[PDB]
Amino acid sequence: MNFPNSTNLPRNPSMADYEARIFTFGTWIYSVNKEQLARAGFYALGEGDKVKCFHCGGGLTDWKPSEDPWEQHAKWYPGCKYLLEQKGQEYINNIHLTHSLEECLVR
Ligand SMILES: COC[C@H]1C[NH2+][C@H](C)CN1CC(=O)N1CC(C)(C)c2cnc(Cc3ccccc3)cc21
Ligand SMILES: [Zn+2]
């Protein structure tokens, strides 16, 4: 799978700019919004809806309409420094508590 980057230095600096990430998508048919994705640090791999974060290297796929780019970034890549910079730890905790409390009402 490859370990997530938790340093303050991006794993993919060529994708550090919003505009660079935006080009990777092209025509995007998926339920998830490409500008929203690029904003959350993601660029497209060109394989279905597979994206990676420029900073942590974290990969995500199979975007349901109910799944938010930032929330998913926090769910699966909580050590991402870009995520911490943009959203703050207070936002990150809420998302974590929300997901971890979803583990309650399902089970
Ligand atoms: C499949 O789980 C549920 C889905 C549902 N839709 C959400 C938007 C996201 N969510 C997590 C996810 O997609 N994960 C979690 C985990 C970290 C375990 C992981 C590992 N590898 C891949 C595949 C991949 C490899 C390389 C680049 C991109 C994608 C996807 C993936
Ligand atoms: Zn990240």
Side-chain angles (χ1 to χ4, degrees):
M1 196 185 84
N2 238 307
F3 74 96
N5 173 44
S6 301
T7 70
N8 290 284
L9 310 97
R11 193 169 264 166
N12 193 355
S14 77
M15 294 291 128
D17 290 332
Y18 170 82
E19 292 301 333
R21 301 198 287 283
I22 215 86
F23 293 131
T24 63
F25 297 87
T27 304
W28 189 251
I29 62 156
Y30 305 108
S31 63
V32 63
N33 181 283
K34 72 158 166 193
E35 21 283 306
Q36 222 158 254
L37 280 161
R39 269 189 264 108
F42 294 108
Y43 61 98
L45 301 185
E47 196 183 355
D49 60 8
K50 280 167 75 165
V51 298
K52 262 185 154 72
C53 175
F54 84 92
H55 200 281
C56 66
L60 298 170
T61 202
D62 299 358
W63 290 90
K64 277 100 222 150
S66 75
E67 294 174 327
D68 177 68
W70 273 126
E71 295 191 5
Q72 295 299 301
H73 204 157
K75 188 164 199 192
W76 296 102
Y77 309 104
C80 175
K81 290 312 198 303
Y82 177 73
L83 162 74
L84 178 61
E85 174 64 15
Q86 297 303 310
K87 305 301 286 178
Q89 190 75 38
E90 47 202 300
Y91 168 91
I92 298 175
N93 291 329
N94 169 287
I95 286 315
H96 294 142
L97 290 153
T98 296
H99 294 322
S100 297
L101 180 65
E102 274 157 326
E103 292 265 309
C104 173
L105 294 165
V106 299
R107 290 177 151 188

